């Protein structure tokens, strides 16, 4: 919500949606840039849901956002409408 500490990934929320929400909230957060970096380096992976949190830990600290996106693509999904 009005705090970056309140942003956590939905149980089935696409990782890409969560990161976007996290980003939007962090931009509004009143803190130094170095602190915002610290928040991204810890809170983002920490508040991801259990399934993505596991994939992220595996990729390591050197992973890029694009690599994280690709790795969590489909977790909680596929999210397609049930084609009757």
């Amino acid at each position: 919500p009005t705090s970056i500490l309140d942003i956590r990934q939905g149980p089935k929320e696409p990782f890409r949606d969560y990161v976007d929400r996290f980003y939007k909230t962090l931009r509004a957060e009143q803190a130094s840039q170095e602190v915002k970096n610290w928040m991204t380096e810890t809170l983002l992976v920490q508040n991801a849901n259990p399934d993505c949190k596991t994939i992220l830990k595996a990729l390591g600290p050197g992973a890029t956002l694009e690599e994280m996106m690709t790795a969590c693509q489909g977790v909680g999904g596929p999210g397609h409408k049930a084609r009757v």
Partner: peptide, 12 residues
Amino acid sequence: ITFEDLLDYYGP
């Protein structure tokens, strides 16, 4: 990743 990475991704 850092906040700057987020900025470059979505940003500017």
